[PDB]
Amino acid sequence: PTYGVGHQPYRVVVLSFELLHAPATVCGPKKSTNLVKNKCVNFNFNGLK
Amino acid sequence: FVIRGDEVRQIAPGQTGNIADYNYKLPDDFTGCVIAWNSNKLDSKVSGN
Numbered sequence: 001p002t003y004g005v006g007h008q009p010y011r012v013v014v015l016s017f018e019l020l021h022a023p024a025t026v027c028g029p030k031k032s033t034n035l036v037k038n039k040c041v042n043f044n045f046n047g048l049k
Numbered sequence: 050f051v052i053r054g055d056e057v058r059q060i061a062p063g064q065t066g067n068i069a070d071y072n073y074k075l076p077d078d079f080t081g082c083v084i085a086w087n088s089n090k091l092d093s094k095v096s097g098n
C-alpha cells in the first residue's frame with residue numbers, strides 16, 4: 001500500500017475480436033425485421049450495409 | 050551511502066521517513082534507480098562501529 005502509484009498493481013484484460021465475419025456468432029444487441037424480395041431496399045445482413 | 054534495513058524502503062520516492070526526509074529525499078519526478086545489498090561482512094564491528 002505504501003508503494004508509489006507507478007508500482008501499484010493493475011488488472012489488464014485484452015479482448016481480441018475476429019472481424020473476418022465468416023460464421024458470425026457473437027452478434028451484438030439489435031432487432032430483426034422481415035425479408036422482402038424484388039425490391040430495392042436497405043439491407044443489413046450481419047452488420048453489412 | 051550506508052543505512053540499516055527499513056530505510057532502504059524509506060528511500061523510495063514520495064515515501065517519508067526521518068532518515069529519508071532529513072538526509073536524501075529523492076524528488077517526486079525521478080528517472081534513475083538504486084542498488085542495495087547486505088554488507089554485514091565488511092561493515093560490522095564486534096564492539097560496535
